[PDB]
Design an enzyme around this catalytic site. Structure first.
Site, mmCIF file in Angstrom:
data_model
loop_
_atom_site.group_PDB
_atom_site.id
_atom_site.type_symbol
_atom_site.label_atom_id
_atom_site.label_comp_id
_atom_site.label_asym_id
_atom_site.label_seq_id
_atom_site.Cartn_x
_atom_site.Cartn_y
_atom_site.Cartn_z
ATOM 1 C CG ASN A 84 2.492 -3.367 -3.289
ATOM 2 O OD1 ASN A 84 2.066 -2.456 -2.579
ATOM 3 N ND2 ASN A 84 1.694 -4.152 -3.998
ATOM 4 N N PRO A 85 4.946 -2.037 -0.225
ATOM 5 C CG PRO A 85 5.382 -0.015 0.849
ATOM 6 C CD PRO A 85 5.257 -0.630 -0.513
ATOM 7 C CB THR A 110 -0.932 0.034 1.209
ATOM 8 O OG1 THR A 110 -1.820 -1.088 1.156
ATOM 9 C CG2 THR A 110 -1.737 1.310 1.221
ATOM 10 C CD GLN A 111 3.633 2.680 -3.082
ATOM 11 O OE1 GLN A 111 4.070 1.676 -2.528
ATOM 12 N NE2 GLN A 111 4.385 3.741 -3.332
ATOM 13 C CG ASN A 112 -1.108 7.391 -1.345
ATOM 14 O OD1 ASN A 112 -0.164 8.003 -0.854
ATOM 15 N ND2 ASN A 112 -1.410 7.448 -2.634
#
Lengths: 213, 240, 49, 215, 201, 239, 228, 238
Positions: free
Chosen positions: D104-105, D1-3
């Protein structure tokens, strides 16, 4: 955005003796302007004659430790014998270049004994070069520690000072003093000190505290 | 008698002899029965020690697929182990995709399609297994199904898999099966397994009993058979 | 195997024990009786290390 | 999740004599709007270990699902062997590191607490894979605020009792209710011992406002 | 970082410094830059440590395989070509590598120059590094073909001394290797300060 | 075993199809090749002109490089494929390695291709046997031969095709170390080999040489006619 | 029947492996002998033609600077295995800066001595003799097509290997010397060969720990043969 | 007999005879014996040689810090399952950072050998594994079979003429559970000395012993820590 790296800091020292290799390291793990812990030893006992220290990004240090341990067991379970020190150094260089295009942010120092029974310290870089040197200081306190070792170990920049071989307790009092002196000015140094000594008879450890701030 | 080589070819009278030979492969296996009550399903397997080399607690044919589902296999053991792993994987997909416990009908249909897919092609053989499937649910009750080596899967109150398939269900059906709770059915299965083959061809056997229902609150586990020890103090009273 | 071949196993186990002049038999005497009833074996052995 | 869409907030955990207490609140704020004010942010793993997390709640649901399936699988092995909490800590660290290696953390901050075989365990897992052990953990702004209270009492007294630990957690959560903007006066305390895992109810805080009568 | 190489009547001279900094900070003083590929090849380290070290070790692997398959020792141009072709497959991905290849041939002397930009060229004199221009200056002062041995030694040694004297990114021990007809032979490892006392007057 | 398929050993330890794919070579046209000391020489027999076509396309002697020369026996289609692949391989060797191609390299390639072609599932073995003659290192003449098994095998002279035992027996009963070459002796040795051919019709002789620095020279069957005449003159001088 | 690498026997066994062990027997002989002084090795070429150039037939090839070899039976399976052994020892030196010991070499070879599988190619038809000098001194090693690798003190292969082993067990013991073992080998050679022993038939290969380089004798072999 | 060719074919009596043939291929190895106490598990094998001068082909090989296997049958499949064994051990040693429990490992071994026993194009693995290990619940001695029907025992013995060993294990399985290492090991070779014909005696160079303990790491022994184990014996009752 997501930054893939973070600077965890740390300080690792190594001294190659006539028949001994001393590796010591603080156990402070921090981040920015906080303290995560005051016990996280950078030293690791690989074999009976090899100790590795790993500073920089901590997760890469953990991953690298586990991969090195796996390949150590693979070499032993394949070839009926443990690795040397320089073999481990070469293998680590192959690994660190095998992730060239997304690097580990890890400084590495391997100390240990050679096959003649003498001390050998193999330094590293984040990308995968190495060399057999007598002493290295990696991490945040690198520049705080190299010139004093140039003064004492190398006997450099001195006049009419003969060269005495470095004994054991002399190296111990050196390591204790340099960690006190570096913990005075560094922010990434203190709260403990894990000193590993490699002789021809095994690995010793020793715990010396520091100032608690 | 043919024409018995491949699992794809037909016969001059229209059946696959591979599937038939695999059906009567399980006929030589150990006798394994099962029966449900009005609030649970009880398993029981006639298991035999080879001579004196076992450990009484190895290779238990009573598997445990999901939290509320386990198998009662009979036939080739390793093939049943693989099939049990496939069933665990299918319950895993259902739990991961829908967030609740697999209904036993759908699980049995997927497993039957898997067995049928191993009966179709010529590269593979049909399975040499025949197993039982039990469950319990608060909105569904007790369900007991049954899968042959071919892949025909439908439901029973009681069943038996092994040598004495007929010779168990001759006297399984004289049980008043609805009005009994399963704690009676435990010693019922004990006496049924103890009736068949005491000493005649082999030397000794040993009993395992699986157990699912409302009394386990929806769990499936082996009985504490040592607790209440209900076979032997009644098995020795079942010889007269 | 039939009844007669098992009788041959009995007699060949006796004779194989008689090759060393054994007073009573042993189990691999019976096993070499099984092998000699079939054809024979030695074993050669290899690939079984 | 980026945001991160729906974030949690700080998680507190500390060992004591033969047990670990963990407490986190129940708020699901989106931006500044406290949109989900009754949610659970602690999974009670089987009988020994116990999990609490921060950051994106959806990822916490995901890891809840995966860990639940793994624990169910080992319990369906029927071998009598379980996961040690340190094994779970290792697995989660490897999972996060292999997650972040693909850029893609999982936007999380997880705390693993467990008590097995006489010894307590309290592990930390970062988003970046940074993972360690500690006698007292504090996430988010808790590492800025309630961390020095834990480290004060642990320096003055290294071991604790269960009552003292629970009271200290109550005080730290009171302080976090005072000056975290993403905080809420409803939290649940979860506790492990050798007697099992227990989730207490939605407790609250007792506050003071007598400085407001000053100018 | 300053390397040079030049061939003459009696073979090839290769010299280099041993300082390898890190930004504004010096890492080491004794970095052996001239990487010993074979008993008949010498490779260097010219811009980047890891790239030069790794790819030259792989080239040494390839050369040993080539000799054990053909029973005949590889030429120099073939080795330089193999290195350039292997480096070229990552062009634009950010490899910095500017090494030199030296050796003796069936043709005799061999001197090539392979970049990570792939500028594989032959020649007679070369110099790589940050302070390479200083070496070019003093080398193209003292260059001839009919030089003696100790003359060429003094030329290269004076050259590396001038280079490390003006540039800031250079220093440490002055290596000096000499390629002969049969095989290469290390000449000397001279410190800067010893040369400063000796050649300052 | 049986003669089916390439993968099974015999009960006494053979591969039937390797011995059997040599038979198609054993039943082909003859082509010899010797090395002189400075000039290499080879040639084929059996031009076999059918009175109504061209023959410039049926040429059994070709080249891969400016240094190396070919020959074969057996069936011709496998020769066409192997030569096609050999040109590509020789040029790809020229791509990386900047040498003129050593003969040992191209023979190792052909034999390696031939053996990994023979190992696989149902790929029919190449029923040829090539002669690979060249002089690269200091102009040192070499000639190697192949086999359907894939064994490159260095010789000094060679005879393949139909009745090769007699032809190689002639090189055994001639083959003098002295002297030297002497290109004249190599030319006369080709003349004696082609006179020692299985048929020696006098017009079915096709020979091509290389003097280890030049390219291939295709001769003219009048120079060869005077060669046969002086061979007959020396045969008369034997009387 | 037996037909196929994927079918056992009613009593054992393959029957493809056995036919490979049968396929060993056709090759030329070779004898390697371990001595604490060093490993010596010999072979017969069986030269057919005078045009058959003797130095081109390979029997002893070079794996390492201190590890020799000898082949048997089929030539090209040996060529494949020699190529792979060269590549992998070089890989060990690559990732370890050291010499792959001879047991580890032969484990690396017999990892795919039997990886034979045409689906999911044929078994190899070559016996190999490995000599080398590890840290444990000299080593002499013998493998087979089936990968069943063992150490041998003095192994003889290929054709007429039975009487070679018998007359070898006649002469061998533990405390032999070098030159005695050399002539002890070539006596067995000119008892198992058919032709007269001379300069071109046989070839030696001796490796010493102090003479690691050049595991060969070149026409002093003439002087050794004329001493019998 | 025309159905007795491939793995895929069911027999008209349902017994796929390729499995039986693989069993008989297991039966032609060397003798080996594995047995456990409550605290120590000992497996002892027997070596053989090709000739007098050659070394003996080894059987006990190392796997992991608490896992070691014996073997009988084929050796290519032995090293293949060895590589798979070491790989699956160090995999969980990487991920979970724990030693593997043994039962799940042998279940993975059975699931590994299931596929070559059902599809077409691979043979069943001729293999004779005797596995010793330590989970939390003590020592384990498992055995396998080419039919992947792995067994747990308290004392087994597989290979050629291994049945007198089984009789010895039957008449001492009550005695096995109590004793410490030394007389346990000499019970193991008081099975192996009946796995041999009576006209020759068990020497040093042909026997191998591997002990794993609850505090003792798995270790193989050959002749030198076996010369202590070989004394303490009497002759057979001739």
């Amino acid at each position: 955005r997501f930054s893939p790296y973070v600077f965890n800091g740390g300080t690792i020292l190594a001294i190659a003796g006539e028949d001994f290799a001393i590796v010591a390291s603080d156990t402070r793990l921090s981040e920015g302007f906080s303290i995560h812990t005051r016990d996280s030893p950078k030293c690791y006992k690989l074999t009976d004659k090899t100790v590795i220290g790993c500073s920089g990004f901590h997760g890469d240090c953990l991953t690298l430790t586990k991969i090195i341990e796996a390949r150590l067991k693979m070499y032993k379970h394949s070839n009926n014998k443990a690795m040397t020190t320089g073999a481990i150094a070469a293998m680590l260089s192959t690994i660190l270049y095998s992730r060239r295009f997304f690097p580990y942010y890890v400084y590495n120092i391997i100390g240990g004994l050679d096959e003649e029974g003498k001390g050998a310290v193999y330094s590293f870089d984040p990308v995968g070069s190495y060399q057999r040197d007598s002493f290295k200081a990696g991490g945040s306190a690198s520049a705080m520690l190299q010139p004093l070792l140039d003064n004492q170990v190398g006997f450099k920049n001195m006049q009419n000072v003969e060269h005495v071989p470095l004994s054991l307790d002399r190296a111990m009092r050196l390591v204790k003093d340099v960690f006190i002196s570096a913990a005075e000015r560094d922010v990434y140094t203190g709260d403990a000190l894990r000193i590993c000594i490699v002789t021809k008879e095994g690995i010793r450890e020793e715990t010396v505290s520091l100032r608690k701030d | 008698t043919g024409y018995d080589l491949s699992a794809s070819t037909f016969s001059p009278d229209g059946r696959v002899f591979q599937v038939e030979y695999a059906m009567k492969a399980v006929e030589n296996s150990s006798t394994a029965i099962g029966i449900r009550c009005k609030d649970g399903v009880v398993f029981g397997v006639e298991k035999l020690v080879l001579s004196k080399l076992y450990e009484e607690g190895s290779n238990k044919r009573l598997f445990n697929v999901d939290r509320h589902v386990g198998m009662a296999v009979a036939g080739l053991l390793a093939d049943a182990r693989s099939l049990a792993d496939i069933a665990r994987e299918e319950a895993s997909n259902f739990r991961s995709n829908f967030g609740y416990n697999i209904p036993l009908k759908h699980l049995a249909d997927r497993v039957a399609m898997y067995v049928h897919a191993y009966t179709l092609y010529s590269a593979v053989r049909p399975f040499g297994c025949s197993f039982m499937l039990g469950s319990y649910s608060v909105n569904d009750g007790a369900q007991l199904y049954m899968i042959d080596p071919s892949g025909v899967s439908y439901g029973y109150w009681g069943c038996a898999i092994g040598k004495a398939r007929q010779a168990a269900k001759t006297e399984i059906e004289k049980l008043q099966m609805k009005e009994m709770t399963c704690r009676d059915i435990v010693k019922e299965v004990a006496k049924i397994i103890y009736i068949v083959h005491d000493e005649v061809k082999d030397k000794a056997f040993e009993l395992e009993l699986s157990w699912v229902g409302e009394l386990t609150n929806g769990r499936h586990e082996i009985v504490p058979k040592d607790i209440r020890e209900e076979a032997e103090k009644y098995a020795k009273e079942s010889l007269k | 195997f039939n009844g007669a071949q098992c009788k041959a196993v009995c007699v060949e186990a006796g004779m194989i024990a008689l090759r060393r002049g054994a007073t009573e038999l042993t189990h691999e005497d019976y096993m070499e009786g099984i092998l000699e009833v079939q054809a024979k074996k030695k074993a050669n052995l290899q690939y079984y290390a | 999740t980026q945001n991160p869409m729906v974030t949690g907030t700080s998680v507190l955990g500390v060992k004591f004599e033969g047990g670990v207490v963990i407490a986190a609140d129940m708020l699901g704020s989106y931006g500044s709007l406290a949109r989900f004010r009754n949610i659970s942010r602690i999974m009670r793993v089987n009988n020994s270990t116990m999990l609490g997390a921060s950051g994106d709640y959806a990822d916490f649901q995901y890891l809840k699902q995966v860990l639940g399936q793994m624990v169910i699988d080992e319990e369906l092995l029927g071998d009598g062997h379980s996961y040690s909490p340190r094994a779970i800590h290792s697995w989660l660290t490897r999972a996060m590191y292999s997650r972040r290696s693909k850029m893609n953390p999982l936007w999380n901050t997880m705390v693993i607490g467990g008590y097995a075989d006489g010894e307590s365990f309290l592990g930390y897992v970062d988003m970046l894979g940074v993972a360690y052990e500690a006698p007292s953990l504090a996430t988010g702004y808790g590492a800025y605020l309630a961390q020095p209270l834990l480290r004060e009492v642990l320096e003055k007294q290294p071991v604790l009792s269960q009552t003292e630990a629970r009271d200290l957690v109550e005080r730290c959560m009171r302080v976090l209710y005072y000056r975290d903007a993403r905080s809420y006066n409803r939290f649940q305390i979860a506790t492990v011992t050798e007697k099992g895992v227990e989730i207490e109810g939605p407790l609250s805080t007792e506050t003071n406002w007598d400085i407001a009568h000053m100018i | 970082t300053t390397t040079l190489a030049f061939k003459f009547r009696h073979g090839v001279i290769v010299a280099a410094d041993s300082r390898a900094t890190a930004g504004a900070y010096i890492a080491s003083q004794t970095v052996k830059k001239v990487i010993e590929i074979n008993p008949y090849l010498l490779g260097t380290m010219a811009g980047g440590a890891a790239d030069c070290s790794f790819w030259e070790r792989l080239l040494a692997r390839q050369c040993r395989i080539y000799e054990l398959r053909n029973k005949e020792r590889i030429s120099v141009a073939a080795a330089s070509k193999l290195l350039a072709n292997m480096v070229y497959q990552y062009k634009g991905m950010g490899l910095s590598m500017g090494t030199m290849i030296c050796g003796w041939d069936k043709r005799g002397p061999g001197l090539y120059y392979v970049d990570s930009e792939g500028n594989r060229i032959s020649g007679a004199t070369f110099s790589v590094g940050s302070g390479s221009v200083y070496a070019y200056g003093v080398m193209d002062r003292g260059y001839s073909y009919d030089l003696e041995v100790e003359q060429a030694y003094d030329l290269a040694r004076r050259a590396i001394y001038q280079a490390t004297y003006r540039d800031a990114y250079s220093g440490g021990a002055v290596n000096l290797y000499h390629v002969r007809e049969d095989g290469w032979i290390r000449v000397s490892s001279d410190n800067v300060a010893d040369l400063h006392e000796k050649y300052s007057g | 075993s049986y003669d089916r398929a390439i993968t099974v050993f015999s009960p006494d330890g053979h591969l039937f199809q390797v011995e059997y794919a040599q038979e198609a070579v054993k039943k082909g046209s003859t082509a010899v090749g010797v090395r002189g000391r400075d000039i290499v020489v080879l040639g084929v027999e059996k031009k076999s002109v059918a009175k109504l076509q061209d023959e410039r396309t049926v040429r059994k002697i070709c080249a891969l490089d400016d240094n190396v020369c070919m020959a074969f026996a057996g069936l011709t289609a496998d020769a066409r494929i192997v030569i096609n692949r050999a040109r590509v391989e020789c040029q790809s060797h020229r791509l990386t390695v900047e040498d003129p191609v050593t003969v040992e390299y191209i023979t190792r390639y052909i034999a390696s291709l031939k053996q990994r072609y023979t190992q696989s599932n149902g790929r029919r073995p190449f029923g040829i046997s090539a002669l690979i003659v060249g002089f690269d290192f200091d102009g040192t003449p070499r000639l190697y031969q192949t086999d359907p098994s894939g064994t490159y095998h260095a010789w000094k002279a060679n005879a393949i095709g139909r009745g090769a035992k007699s032809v190689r027996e002639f090189l055994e009963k001639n083959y003098t170390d002295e002297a030297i070459e002497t290109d004249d002796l190599t030319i006369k040795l080709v003349i004696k080999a082609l006179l020692e051919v299985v048929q020696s019709g006098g017009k079915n002789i096709e020979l091509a040489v290389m003097r280890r620095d030049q390219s291939l020279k295709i001769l003219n069957p009048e120079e060869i006619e005077k060669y046969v005449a002086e061979i007959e003159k020396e045969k008369e001088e034997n009387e | 029947y037996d037909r196929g690498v994927n079918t056992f026997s009613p009593e054992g066994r393959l029957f493809q492996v056995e036919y490979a062990i049968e396929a060993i027997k056709l090759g030329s002989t070779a004898i390697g002998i371990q001595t604490s002084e060093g490993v010596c090795l010999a072979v017969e070429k069986r030269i057919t033609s005078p045009l058959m150039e003797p130095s081109s037939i390979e029997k002893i090839v070079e794996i390492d600077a201190h590890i020799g070899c000898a082949m048997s039976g089929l030539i090209a399976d040996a060529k494949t295995l020699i190529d792979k052994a060269r590549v992998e020892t070089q890989n060990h030196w690559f990732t370890y800066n050291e010499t792959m010991t001879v047991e580890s070499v032969t484990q690396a070879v017999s990892n795919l001595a039997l990886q034979f599988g045409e689906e999911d190619s044929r078994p190899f038809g070559v016996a190999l003799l490995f000599g080398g000098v590890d840290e444990k001194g000299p080593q002499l090693f013998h493998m087979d097509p089936s990968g069943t690798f063992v150490q041998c003190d003095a192994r003889a292969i290929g054709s007429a290997s039975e009487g070679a082993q018998s007359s070898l067990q006649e002469v061998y013991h533990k405390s032999m010397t070098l030159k005695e073992a050399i002539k002890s080998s070539l006596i067995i050679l000119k008892q198992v060969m058919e032709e007269k022993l001379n300069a071109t038939n046989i070839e030696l290969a001796t490796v010493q720990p102090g003479q690691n380089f050049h595991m060969f004798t070149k026409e002093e072999l003439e002087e050794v043969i004329k001493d019998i | 007999n025309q159905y007795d060719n491939d793995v895929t074919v069911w027999s008209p009596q349902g017994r796929i005879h390729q499995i039986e043939y693989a069993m008989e291929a297991v039966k032609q190895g060397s003798a080996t014996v594995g047995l456990k106490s409550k605290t120590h598990a000992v497996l002892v094998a027997l070596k053989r040689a090709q000739s007098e001068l050659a070394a003996h082909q080894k059987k006990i090989l190392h796997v992991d810090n608490h896992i070691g296997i014996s073997i009988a049958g084929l050796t290519a499949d032995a090293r293949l399952l060895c590589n798979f064994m070491r790989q699956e051990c160090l995999d969980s040693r990487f991920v979970f950072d724990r030693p593997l429990p043994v039962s799940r490992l042998v279940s993975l071994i059975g699931s590994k050998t299931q596929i070559p026993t059902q599809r077409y194009g691979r043979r069943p693995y001729g293999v004779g594994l005797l596995i010793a290990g330590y989970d939390d619940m003590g020592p384990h001695i498992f055995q396998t079979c080419p039919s992947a029907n792995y067994f747990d025992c308290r004392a087994m013995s597989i290979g050629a003429r291994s049945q007198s060993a089984r009789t010895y294990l039957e008449r001492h399985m009550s005695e096995f559970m109590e004793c410490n290492l030394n007389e346990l090991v000499k019970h193991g070779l008081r099975a192996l000395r009946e796995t041999l014909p009576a006209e020759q005696d068990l020497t040093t160079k042909n026997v191998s012993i591997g002990i794993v303990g609850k505090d003792l790491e798995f270790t193989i022994y050959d002749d030198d820590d076996v010369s202590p184990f070989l004394e303490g014996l009497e002759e057979r009752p001739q």
